[PDB]
Amino acid sequence: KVFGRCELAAAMKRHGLDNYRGYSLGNWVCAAKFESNFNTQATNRNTDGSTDYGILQINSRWWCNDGRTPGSRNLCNIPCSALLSSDITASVNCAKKIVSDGNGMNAWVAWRNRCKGTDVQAWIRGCRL
């Protein structure tokens, strides 16, 4: 499923991401836009044997089990396939653990390269939240 910008914003706000760990909603919407372009089915295979899954491109090496990643840990305790559903609940809850893992939102490279330090409030424009 592909979310509309405000549709995703609402969903994220609903799952408690607005200001979570001090990160405004805009930050999360911006991260999702550049990590997967709002597509829940998005997947990107990495050259290290791991794969990023879902709307927030969560990595299989440490956060979810996809059964084909060497020396992988399953800290979020879920199959990576759950991160590819139309329901972002799984991704949000796992994301909540990642952002608290000691690097802030720097854990998401796309957020770091395209959202960090910008006016992320624009990503919430036109939204009736």
Side-chain angles (χ1 to χ4, degrees):
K1 172 189 175 176
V2 169
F3 281 81
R5 189 163 55 66
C6 298
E7 167 181 40
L8 176 66
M12 298 190 133
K13 166 85 123 57
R14 187 173 303 121
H15 286 80
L17 286 181
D18 181 44
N19 296 151
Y20 189 79
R21 297 285 288 190
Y23 289 102
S24 66
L25 189 58
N27 279 297
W28 299 96
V29 176
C30 188
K33 195 284 161 44
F34 294 118
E35 284 293 350
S36 72
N37 203 54
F38 306 146
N39 177 18
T40 64
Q41 316 272 50
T43 64
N44 184 72
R45 221 303 180 60
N46 294 304
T47 59
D48 66 323
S50 65
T51 305
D52 300 321
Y53 301 82
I55 199 158
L56 282 173
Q57 291 296 81
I58 294 167
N59 187 263
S60 66
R61 197 47 134 291
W62 299 284
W63 310 99
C64 51
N65 166 49
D66 65 2
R68 67 204 207 192
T69 302
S72 68
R73 199 175 194 62
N74 182 24
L75 294 181
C76 281
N77 211 334
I78 46 80
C80 303
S81 55
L83 300 177
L84 299 183
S85 61
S86 300
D87 179 336
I88 68 176
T89 297
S91 286
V92 175
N93 296 329
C94 179
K96 283 184 181 174
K97 177 170 184 179
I98 295 173
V99 71
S100 311
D101 203 46
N103 295 302
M105 292 194 70
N106 288 297
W108 289 276
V109 69
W111 172 83
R112 186 280 233 183
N113 297 324
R114 300 188 170 297
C115 314
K116 193 174 181 179
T118 73
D119 176 17
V120 294
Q121 199 180 317
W123 293 99
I124 245 62
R125 87 154 82 84
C127 306
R128 318 90 145 188
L129 301 167

